[PDB]
Design a protein around this nucleic acid. Structure first.
Ligand SMILES: [K+]
Ligand SMILES: [K+]
Ligand SMILES: [K+]
Ligand SMILES: [K+]
Ligand SMILES: [K+]
Ligand SMILES: [Mg+2]
Ligand SMILES: [Mg+2]
Ligand SMILES: [Mg+2]
Ligand SMILES: [Mg+2]
Ligand SMILES: [Mg+2]
Ligand SMILES: [Mg+2]
Ligand SMILES: [Mg+2]
Ligand SMILES: [Mg+2]
Ligand SMILES: [Mg+2]
Ligand SMILES: [Mg+2]
Ligand SMILES: [Mg+2]
Ligand SMILES: [Mg+2]
Ligand SMILES: [Mg+2]
Ligand SMILES: [Mg+2]
Ligand SMILES: [Mg+2]
Ligand SMILES: [Mg+2]
Ligand SMILES: [Mg+2]
Ligand SMILES: [Mg+2]
Ligand SMILES: [Mg+2]
Ligand SMILES: [Mg+2]
Ligand SMILES: [Mg+2]
Ligand SMILES: [Mg+2]
Ligand SMILES: [Mg+2]
Ligand SMILES: [Mg+2]
Ligand SMILES: [Mg+2]
Lengths: 120, 74, 158, 341, 102, 319
RNA sequence: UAGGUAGUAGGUUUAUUAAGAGUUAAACCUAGCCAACGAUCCAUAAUCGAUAAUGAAAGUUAGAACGAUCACGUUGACUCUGAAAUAUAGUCAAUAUCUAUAAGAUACAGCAGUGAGGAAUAUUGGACAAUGAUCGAAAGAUUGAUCCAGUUACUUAUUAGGAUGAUAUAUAAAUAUAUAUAUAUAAAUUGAUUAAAAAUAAAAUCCAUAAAUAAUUAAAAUAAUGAUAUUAAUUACCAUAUAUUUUUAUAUGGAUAUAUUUUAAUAGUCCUGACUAAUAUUUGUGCCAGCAGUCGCGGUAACACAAAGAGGGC
């Protein structure tokens, strides 16, 4: 990632139980220093599904909280997301396939579920 | 009452009370001094710790051993 | 600690939220009128009174507020490509897509912020007027004479 | 947790959350907490001694002090003023230990799914307890209103049932049972008329508390209540048991035993694979402790219960089950408010 | 994933272990020239077979490259300058210019 | 003044006399053997009036004060038996008048020293089925069934939940004979609930007592000014107490008024799921300044109040 | 520490700067400016929070940990580059050390580690798998940042076994179901001779789980990559089907001899005259030995010293 303003994960939580803040930060500041803004949170550990749920067809869910509007503003002013944040934003539908790379380009992989925007 | 004059590592010279029945403290013995005065001895404002440095624990102490540097009998 | 009580018992802090629009916009008519309003003088006045020389080398008046025209801000910051250039190259296509998305995002951010600011002024004006009307109604009920008031001794004439 | 030592000491006479025989005598003979002639500190200490012995003794003092909540919860009946009957004072201070009632281990004891809080902890720790379908193995798990919790049926039967006798212990009871049966057949045969006369007189004093009379009426229908010499003749003498011969061989032993009440199985071991006394009977001294909680709805057929609410104090009643009166709890509350100062 | 097919440059596992380099030719006996073993064994199996941390990760990276038709040529690990690391270069150079050229 | 006091029985008992030197007995142990009575060869205490469970829906709770420590009775006639000089058990010289007319409240009070603790009433297997069939089939509301049978709404909702579990257990033959035996025994130990009996009915007007109202405010108003519950509610800045009761009755899952839709206004995105992916991303819209882990928050891990929680699997996790 | 200040206080002009100003340098004027509501001087100290401690609270304390800010990188000054540096740079000097003896190099307040000082604070560990940072078009390289583990009860939390349990023999005709089983005989640890206990305490009995063993195996991470790691968890011959909040249950394919891995439980420390919870007594010592937060205790019946029994805390 390049630039002075980057969107990246700052690590919180405890040893062996990482949680992350999605933050807009100056490139030169420490990973866990108070950033410019905290856009959201990322919990990397998927929620465990029960034996019955698994056969029932439930897929484990990773939970991300994100300010969609504020994130778009920072992309608009040229903030540069990290690779992991890029994957999150492409899955959220904020970023598109123009931000994909040659190593992760899923040009030929079947879609089992299409991105669905709902209200809850 | 058995006492001892002690020169602390900071240069202060104090008078420390030696608790317990019987002690093997001599001149040049390394002792550790803690707070606590001897009420009936004026000017003795400190205590030496039994079982530390060159001061051994009270011989044959059965009760309240931790206060007199006495290890647990097998 | 006890200090957290002042902030909803929230422990720790967040960075101060930045303002998308760093100055008032040309559509915030309410602000534009206030700055134009004549500055008061006297005990609660602001500025140099007529006939009072201001310090030599200093500006007598305060610098004029810079109001942002969102149409001009959008035109200078995220201007559109002047020609439909031939993006046959793989890298040119990616850059075109990224530029289009970035321009779409920032234009929506500036126009949503201006709308929010204008909508917030209107909501406050409506809310204040409601509160004012409710206070008058509440006060009128308080001033309404009840039958129990007959048992309160009075010396109106004196 | 705190190590369990001298919990049922008769000299100390502390009352515990258990159905133990020794714990029943301590409760029987207590006669209230003596608070007369004591200074305020001594009164508070005594109250603390008694209450903590019963309410969460397994918790360390420092852990309890952290758990303790100064805020107590009551309810306001909005119809009291619309009744006209003499109102009763709410026992607010009986809620001092209510915070413990939401713990899973306490909930099991109040549901009578375990014979003591200590046993409830072991049931939870060994994987026999589920809350809302999920196995919870932490005794300190806190329940919320509406939660349902269940215990493996075999564990609840082992807690509310009599102890399973060992083969040797149950084989000496059958030997004595055979001897005392052959004495009833020798007294019935030598003088049948007197035995039957005594038998009829016993059935008059049953009071219906003894269902044996209801069963007996059936037997009199299986054969006016007039004597019958065929009865004495029908009676047969069981064969003696040589403990040594059938020692270590249960199938042999349970084929040489055939009594009118216990047929082909050793005393208390009708199904030696089950973990309790078989056929299942209630544990001794269960009545004094069998208290139905107001804050749990229990289904004993399935060993399921629902945590309705946190126990509350209402006019004239506290849902926190306690063997101590309000004055004792008031002193205990005064102690913990100030951290024992 | 699936088993790629042997090519002309990389006919067998031994040729694969020689092209990638980094002393990975010393594991020829671990794989036994079995093409499928190279493309089925994951890190857990390789760790049980005595492959050290650095080598097993390197092999798995080159196995993924081969599966995707990307070059598997050896890329060397970085090395400090002849005159030493930056923090000790001024001292080293001063003592090397007074013992070679005086 | 305070001293250590061995917990001797408050009631009179036969103390130890001269003892053979090897008995090494205690007065507490002999007082317990007198309470228990003789132990038979089967390990039972048949003479103790508490050894066996009641079977008439009347709890047999200890009454040491009223019987003055006399816990022995004939196992079949239930007639008092007391210790005599011979060392045998026989009829008492004088009948105990304190044990023949016991108050109704005391019968349900398990602990002699606490009259504020009473046992609850067991619901009959019929009332439970009626409640189950009315909420589920007839479609009555929990508020109606609560006001009909005199049961609090949470208890009504619990009965439906538990009867559903008993149907599944009976539908799979999981209720064994031992479970049936135990259930019936426990049913015959408690007083059965009577919806008609007014005293047995549960109060249905209870509301939680708030904390702001717990204080005592007083207002001096005109001598003939009316002041009622609604005026008090305005003074205390709380909804009327009757409103609180009504809102608490619409909480039951089968109760009227149960509504939850004002929260369905949070934009959520479910990320695309591709073949081979082991998890799906769910994005929830949030607001800068509220979302995120705060910087410099109090670390409580090394403090007595460290936050401990439980995950979906029931595993203890630090929060 | 009572007087302090002399670019000191103010005015005007130039130089310098992106920019105000005695900020710096030069010139010329006015006599001001600060101070007993504490000037000047001296001493001490990194500052603070939605952090920690405490209290009913106002507050008080800390400033390790988390975060914010400042200053410094052996000491002093100066210069270069730059938007910004008196830079952990360069120059000169100071102090110390070193080897190559040069107008030389080094300065661990980066990590680990060593000596010293001190009452007292740890590994010369693993890995770049994760999150970041730098370089590169990329492939990738580097990373004592960081993530992990090690050491240390320094702090917190969970667990660290439940139910039953006061004796042993002999004893008793020769199935409408009994039943308050009853007799003998022996045995019975410390204290004590009854409200003096130790003590349901122990053993024993019943039933468990942990660990082990076996199989299985997530998640941290995916396009691939796992340091931690002998992973957590789960299951108890393994697999499968059906029914089956959970869960349960039946039946099946393979697997061993009708049944199916094994199986536990040794806490310390202080105290018992009053403040202050501790009644069951006893021995030694004799104003000695000693105890002591306060009052005090000890001179032959010591509830206080040193112990035994018993007891109270954590
Ligand atoms: K507390
Ligand atoms: K001063
Ligand atoms: K430190
Ligand atoms: K890395
Ligand atoms: K102890
Ligand atoms: Mg780049
Ligand atoms: Mg002492
Ligand atoms: Mg006392
Ligand atoms: Mg100037
Ligand atoms: Mg100056
Ligand atoms: Mg000048
Ligand atoms: Mg300093
Ligand atoms: Mg402060
Ligand atoms: Mg700090
Ligand atoms: Mg300070
Ligand atoms: Mg530090
Ligand atoms: Mg510096
Ligand atoms: Mg310096
Ligand atoms: Mg320098
Ligand atoms: Mg240094
Ligand atoms: Mg270091
Ligand atoms: Mg030292
Ligand atoms: Mg390293
Ligand atoms: Mg003796
Ligand atoms: Mg195991
Ligand atoms: Mg993997
Ligand atoms: Mg004496
Ligand atoms: Mg004392
Ligand atoms: Mg003593
Ligand atoms: Mg002792």
């Amino acid at each position: 990632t390049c630039g002075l303003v980057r969107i990246r994960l700052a690590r919180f939580g405890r040893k062996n139980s990482p949680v992350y803040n999605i933050v807009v930060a100056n490139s030169r500041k420490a990973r866990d220093a108070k950033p410019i803004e905290v856009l959201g949170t990322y919990v990397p550990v998927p929620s465990p599904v029960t034996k019955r749920e698994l056969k029932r067809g439930v897929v484990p869910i990773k939970d991300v909280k994100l300010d969609f509007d504020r994130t778009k503003y920072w992309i608009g002013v040229g903030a540069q997301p990290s690779e992991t944040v890029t994957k999150l934003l492409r899955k959220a539908g904020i970023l598109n396939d123009a931000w994909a790379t040659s190593k992760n380009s899923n040009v030929n992989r079947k879609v089992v579920f299409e991105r669905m925007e709902t209200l809850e | 009452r058995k006492a001892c004059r002690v020169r602390l590592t900071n240069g202060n010279v104090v008078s420390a009370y030696i608790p317990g029945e019987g002690h093997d403290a001599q001149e040049h013995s390394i002792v550790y001094v803690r707070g606590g005065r001897c009420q009936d001895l004026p000017g003795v404002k400190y205590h030496v710790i039994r079982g530390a440095g060159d001061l051994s624990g009270v011989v044959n102490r059965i009760s309240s051993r931790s206060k007199y540097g006495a290890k647990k009998p097998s | 600690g006890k200090g957290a009580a002042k902030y909803g018992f929230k422990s720790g802090v967040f960075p101060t939220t930045r303002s998308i629009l760093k100055s008032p916009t040309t559509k915030q008519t309410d602000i534009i009128n206030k700055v134009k309003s004549p500055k008061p003088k006297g005990v609660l006045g602001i500025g140099y009174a007529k006939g009072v020389k201001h310090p030599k080398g200093s500006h007598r008046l305060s610098p004029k507020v810079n109001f942002i025209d969102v149409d001009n801000l959008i035109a200078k910051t995220v201007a559109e490509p002047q020609s439909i250039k031939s993006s046959n190259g793989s890298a040119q296509k990616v850059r075109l897509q990224k530029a289009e998305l970035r321009r779409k995002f920032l234009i929506e951010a500036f126009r949503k912020e201006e709308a929010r600011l204008l909508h917030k002024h209107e909501y406050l004006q409506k809310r204040t007027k409601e509160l004012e009307k409710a206070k008058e109604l509440e006060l009128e009920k308080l001033n309404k004479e009840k039958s129990s008031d007959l048992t309160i001794m009075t010396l109106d004439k004196m | 947790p705190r190590k369990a030592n001298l919990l049922k000491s008769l000299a100390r006479g502390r009352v515990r959350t258990s159905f133990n025989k020794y714990n029943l005598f301590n409760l029987y003979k207590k006669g209230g907490v003596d608070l007369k002639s004591k200074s305020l500190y001594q009164q508070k200490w005594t109250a603390k001694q008694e209450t903590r012995a019963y309410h969460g003794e397994h918790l360390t003092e420092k852990r309890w002090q952290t758990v303790f909540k100064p805020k107590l919860d009551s309810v306001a009946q909005l119809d009291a003023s619309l009744r006209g009957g003499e109102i009763k004072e709410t026992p607010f201070l009986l809620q001092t230990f209510a915070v413990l009632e939401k713990r899973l281990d306490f909930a099991l004891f109040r549901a009578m799914f375990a014979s003591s809080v200590r046993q409830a902890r072991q049931f939870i720790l060994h994987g026999n307890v589920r809350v809302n379908g999920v196995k919870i193995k932490h005794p300190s798990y806190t329940l919320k209103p509406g939660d349902m919790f269940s215990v493996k049926p075999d564990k609840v039967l082992e807690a509310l049932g009599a102890k399973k006798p060992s083969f040797q212990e149950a084989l000496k009871i059958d030997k004595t049972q055979i001897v005392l049966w052959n004495k009833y057949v020798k007294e019935a045969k030598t003088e049948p008329k007197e035995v039957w006369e005594k038998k009829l007189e016993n059935f008059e004093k049953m009071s219906d508390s003894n269902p044996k009379k209801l069963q007996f009426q059936e037997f009199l229908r299986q054969y006016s209540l007039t004597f019958d010499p065929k009865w004495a003749k029908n009676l047969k003498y069981h064969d003696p048991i040589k403990l040594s011969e059938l020692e270590g061989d249960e199938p042999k032993a349970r084929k040489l035993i055939n009594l009118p009440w216990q047929k082909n199985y050793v005393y208390g071991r009708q199904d030696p694979k089950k973990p309790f006394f078989t056929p299942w009977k209630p544990r001794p001294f269960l009545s004094p402790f069998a208290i139905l909680p107001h804050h749990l709805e229990i289904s004993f057929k399935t060993c399921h219960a629902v945590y309705l609410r946190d126990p509350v104090a209402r006019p004239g009643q506290s849902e926190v089950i306690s063997p101590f009166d309000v004055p004792v709890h008031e002193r205990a509350y005064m102690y913990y408010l100030r951290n024992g100062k | 994933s699936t088993i790629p097919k042997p090519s002309d440059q990389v006919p067998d596992v031994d040729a694969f272990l020689n092209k990638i380099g980094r002393n990975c030719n010393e594991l020829k006996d671990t794989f036994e020239n079995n093409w499928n073993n190279l493309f089925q064994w994951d890190s857990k199996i390789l760790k049980e077979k005595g492959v050290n941390i650095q080598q097993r990760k390197y092999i798995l990276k080159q196995v993924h490259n081969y599966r995707n038709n990307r070059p598997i040529h050896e890329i060397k690990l970085g090395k400090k300058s002849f005159f030493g690391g930056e923090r000790k270069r001024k001292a080293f150079t001063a003592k090397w210019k007074a013992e070679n050229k005086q | 003044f305070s001293r250590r006091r061995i917990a001797y029985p408050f009631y009179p008992f036969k103390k130890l006399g001269r003892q053979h030197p090897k008995k090494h007995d205690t007065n507490l142990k002999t007082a317990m053997r007198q309470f228990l009575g003789p132990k038979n060869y089967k390990g039972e205490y048949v003479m103790n009036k508490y050894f066996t469970v009641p079977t008439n829906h009347v709890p047999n709770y200890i009454k040491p004060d009223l019987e003055r420590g006399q816990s022995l009775e004939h196992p079949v006639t239930k007639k008092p038996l007391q210790l005599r000089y011979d060392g045998t058990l026989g009829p008492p010289p004088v009948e105990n008048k304190r044990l023949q007319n016991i108050f109704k409240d005391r019968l349900l009070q398990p602990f002699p020293s606490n009259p504020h603790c009473k046992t609850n009433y067991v619901l009959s297997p019929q009332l439970k089925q009626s409640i189950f069939e009315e909420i589920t089939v007839e479609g009555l509301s929990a508020q109606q069934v609560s006001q009909k049978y005199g049961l609090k709404i949470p208890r009504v909702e619990a009965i439906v939940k538990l009867v559903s579990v008993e149907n599944s257990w009976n539908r799979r033959n999981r209720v064994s004979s031992d479970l049936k035996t135990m259930d019936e025994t426990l049913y015959r130990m408690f007083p059965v609930f009577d919806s008609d009996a007014s005293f047995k009915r549960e109060n249905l007007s209870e509301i939680p007592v708030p904390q702001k109202t717990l204080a005592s405010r007083f207002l001096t108003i005109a001598e003939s000014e009316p002041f009622g519950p609604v005026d008090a509610a305005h003074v205390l800045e709380l909804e009327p107490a009757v409103e609180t009761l009504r809102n608490l009755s619409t909480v039951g899952e089968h109760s009227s008024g149960h509504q939850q839709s004002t929260n369905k206004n949070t934009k959520v995105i479910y990320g695309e799921l591709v073949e081979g992916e082991r998890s799906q991303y769910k994005f929830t819209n949030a607001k800068v300044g509220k979302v995120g882990y705060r910087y410099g928050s109090g670390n409580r891990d090394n403090k007595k109040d460290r936050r401990i929680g439980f995950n979906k699997l029931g595993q203890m996790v630090y929060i």
